[PDB]
Paper text:
The PPX hydrolyzes and releases the Pi progressively from the linear polyP chain. Bacterial PPXs share conserved catalytic domains 1 and 2 belonging to the catalytic N‐domain, and most members of the PPX family contain two additional domains 3 and 4 in the C‐terminal. The [name] belongs to the ASKHA (Acetate and Sugar Kinases, Hsp70, Actin) superfamily protein, which utilizes a common fold for binding and catalyzing hydrolysis of ATP phosphoanhydride.
Protein crystal structures of PPX homologs from different bacterial species, including DrPPX from Deinoccocus radiodurans, AbPPX from Acinetobacter baumannii, and KpPPX from [name], were determined and refined to resolutions of 1.8‐2.6 Å, respectively (crystallographic data together with the data collection and refinement statistics were summarized in Table  1). While the KpPPX and AbPPX crystallized as a symmetric dimer, the DrPPX crystallographic structure exhibited an asymmetric homodimer. The AtPPX has a ɑ‐linker consisting of 9 amino acids (Gly298‐Ser306), the KpPPX and HpPPX have ɑ‐linkers of 12 amino acids (Ala296 – Gly307, Gly285‐Leu296, respectively), the EcPPX and AbPPX have ɑ‐linkers of 15 amino acids (Ala296 – Lys310), while the DrPPX has a ɑ‐linker of 20 amino acids (Ala300 – Ala319). The shorter α‐linker (AtPPX, KpPPX, and HpPPX) enabled the C‐terminal domain 3 to interact with domain 2 of the N‐terminal, while the longer α‐linkers (DrPPX, EcPPX, and AbPPX) facilitated the interaction of C‐terminal domain 3 with domain 1 and led to a relatively loose dimer formation. Furthermore, we compared the superposition of the protein structures. In terms of the polyP hydrolysis activity of the PPXs, the DrPPX with the longest ɑ‐linker exhibited the weakest activity, while the KpPPX with the shortest ɑ‐linker showed the strongest activity, demonstrating a strong negative correlation of ɑ‐linker length with PPX activity across the species.
Residue numbers in the entry:
A (entry chain A), B (entry chain B): 9 to 508
Write the structure that this text describes.
Amino acid sequence: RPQEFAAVDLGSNSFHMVIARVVDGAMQIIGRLKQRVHLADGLDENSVLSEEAMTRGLNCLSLFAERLQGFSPSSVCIVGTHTLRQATNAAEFLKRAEKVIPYPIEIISGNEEARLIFMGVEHTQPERGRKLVIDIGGGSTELVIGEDFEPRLVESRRMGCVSFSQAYFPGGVINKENFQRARLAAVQKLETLAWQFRIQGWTVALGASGTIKAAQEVLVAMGEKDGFITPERLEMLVSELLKHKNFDALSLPGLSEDRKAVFAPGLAILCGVFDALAIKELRLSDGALREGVLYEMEGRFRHQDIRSRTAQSLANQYNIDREQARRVLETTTQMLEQWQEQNPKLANPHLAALLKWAVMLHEVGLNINHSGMHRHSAYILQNSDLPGFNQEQQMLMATLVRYHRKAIKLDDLPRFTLFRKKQFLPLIQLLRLGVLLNNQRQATTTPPTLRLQTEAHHWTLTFPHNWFSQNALVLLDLEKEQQYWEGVPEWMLKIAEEEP
Amino acid sequence: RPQEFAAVDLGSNSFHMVIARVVDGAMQIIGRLKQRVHLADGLDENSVLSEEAMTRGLNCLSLFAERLQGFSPSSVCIVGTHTLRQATNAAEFLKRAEKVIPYPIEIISGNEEARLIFMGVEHTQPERGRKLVIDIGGGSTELVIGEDFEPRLVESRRMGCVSFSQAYFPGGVINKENFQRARLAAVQKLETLAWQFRIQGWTVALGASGTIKAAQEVLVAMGEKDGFITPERLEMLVSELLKHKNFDALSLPGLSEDRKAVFAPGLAILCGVFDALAIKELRLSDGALREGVLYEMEGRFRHQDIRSRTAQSLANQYNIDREQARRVLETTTQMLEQWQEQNPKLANPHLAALLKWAVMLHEVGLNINHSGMHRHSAYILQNSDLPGFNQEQQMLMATLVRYHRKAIKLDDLPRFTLFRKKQFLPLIQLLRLGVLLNNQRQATTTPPTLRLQTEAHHWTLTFPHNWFSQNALVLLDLEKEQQYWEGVPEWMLKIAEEEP
Ligand SMILES: [K+]
Ligand SMILES: [K+]
Ligand SMILES: [K+]
Ligand SMILES: [K+]
Ligand SMILES: [K+]
Ligand SMILES: [K+]
Ligand SMILES: [K+]
Ligand SMILES: [K+]
Ligand SMILES: [Mg+2]
């Protein structure tokens, strides 16, 4: 039986339990239970947790305990974060919980919390290199810069969307002076770290938790479909926010009812983080504290390049013929480099990387069926949980694979928020030809030279002199592909041989 | 690297190559090449194969050879059938074939051909009992009775759709006298076996190859949706055929152009087989000679109940938690037996078995994602190649799994030729409840008693007295399921506890 374990996050807004089993190097989620306990809402001005909040929390823990019956304590990790760190009657809550759930609650430090969030990012997110990770919680904010599974700068500050609500927006009143007071308070807590962080720098800035997730959802709902948080987009958010007089009137697109009461103080802190660190683009990370517990503390997953780790896992799960993947990769890369030289304005290194991963993974669907494999592979790639690829990157890979066989219908293409069609359409063409030219698998006869010439979507592939006199089946398959391209307006595939 | 091999069938109508690898007890096709060589059309009245037909065959073999470059001879099995048995210059074709493909062609006897067709049926088809297997080819017809991977009676007769075309439909003329002569000629060839076969008997009659496939496709196109071939439906086929004067003029719904010129002689043989053996119902098998070569001669797959063999393969490929399947099976079965005793008219043992297999396989999609698992499992079950399940049975299993979580939309139900909605809808209700009551996996608390009362689609589940005092999470999930049933017209789920 595969190893199973549970990560339990007793946070400021929700109590959240995840149960997973480890199979072939993949973290397979097998259960998830969450309730919006709103524990942070129960902290009064003296940091005493109300009876009402403790009662909601204990009721949630009793449900978790029912689901964890029989689990070894070695397979359960329950962490309490800033709300339980901050509550002066935290011992009372733990006393009650001991009678309800038979696993100890580990109240972790802000340093430990920041490290766990970073580790969840490192185990799951696409971007490699130095990264800035921001998490604005209910009563604490964590900021980390690190790389290669190693935090370098680790900071936590006592500010969050709930604790700033009453302090700076008493009675839930929204005006520019309340907002600016909250925003300047956040900058002041970041004063002593701001330049240290800017000087370390980062390849990407990533955010986690409700406040940042809410900001991303409001922007997307307001038409900014890519979801990146930028200073200009924050300015628009603040302007729409300040058109409301109270939390009760808040009617922003994409703002959930759960987030209405904390969106203004959260947005103030987010603006202060941007002012302090001069962030230009912040992207929401879907991996955070719970993934740090699962991947690092419990699963002990390998510290290696995440996309490669995920690809190795998929090769085991899906019996990937590695020699087939490799010969397709070599052919596709040889043509890609010629296409790139001839079309430097279309060349995109991030898209080129995804084309190569799509080559590695294009046969994952072969265990379902040879018939329609391109669809079955795309189904797996689109719907799986793949560390190292966000949803757009997954959708792009799945799209390249989906289109690598049979009739090409460009009207069925997904809409991408970032990727431009002019830049990934030639990648479909390259994948189709690279797979085709290796479709005899280990029987493939690899041409010693292969020249690609492009004029818009008219492509000429030239093979050695007299090549096809020995490779009639390749030519039949290429002639079929020519008919497929003939079916795409403006496309044309020409096949040629070198002169003697 | 997994075991890999090629099965090559040099038949009367087409030359067909299949290449497959064996992974986790699954036959995974990875290559297929076929050409309609029409080798039997080159046999003259003296059974001499024309050089023109030989050249069509040599061209095809040269393409197969290109795809087989480097294959070990032990990994390639090429079989020749009646056309090469009957040809007086078969040795000439074999000598020429040495120039274009470096693997020997084994010309097999009619009895070995019959046994391989039977073994292909045994390894792939859902019907488990003693079976009659009929294969009407271009110049030979095979008839086998056997069970449990063991032929009991094996026979081949020199009659086929191509050989009977010239002999009884000279010039391609269609009239009742030509047809009757061919039909009686078929009966005459069967006189020496008919009594012996009748005495052995059969649970089911299965047919394979083009003639029988064409008959089924014409019946379906004419409105006989289940595609089963009966004496009454054959009489309709003859009456329609005899309204046409020649092969060129012949036009029937569902008859392809490739089959138009051999449909009348093939149908006459089929009618003669139905007469000689008193067949009342014949179903088309999609497994035959090539599957016998692949599954028996090359793969050497286990002689066991095919559905169980397939399920054990899927359990390995898809990491099925067997204890979870077991507890869901026990719960679903306890409720199924109560529903059956209360609805004996709706009870159906075939559908009941498909429910139990759906239980065993409902988590095959969990490796793709916990999120949407019911859709992912259905995707795998619907699109895989599953020995022991025909297309309709596969779609029924996939449909049960697809509907076992989340909103219930009966208007998206697939239409089945055989299975009636009123009979499988309660199977959806049973699987949903059986999975739900075990959704805490090994932490499940199994009620000592569980009573199901059905009044049409108004179901009452009664749990032990005060049961939910310690199973609050089960009650929450049942209350959600009650909301799901509220969304289906005339459905209602009631939850109760026994009196003290
Ligand atoms: K339980
Ligand atoms: K936080
Ligand atoms: K602080
Ligand atoms: K930035
Ligand atoms: K080759
Ligand atoms: K070769
Ligand atoms: K019968
Ligand atoms: K239990
Ligand atoms: Mg991902």
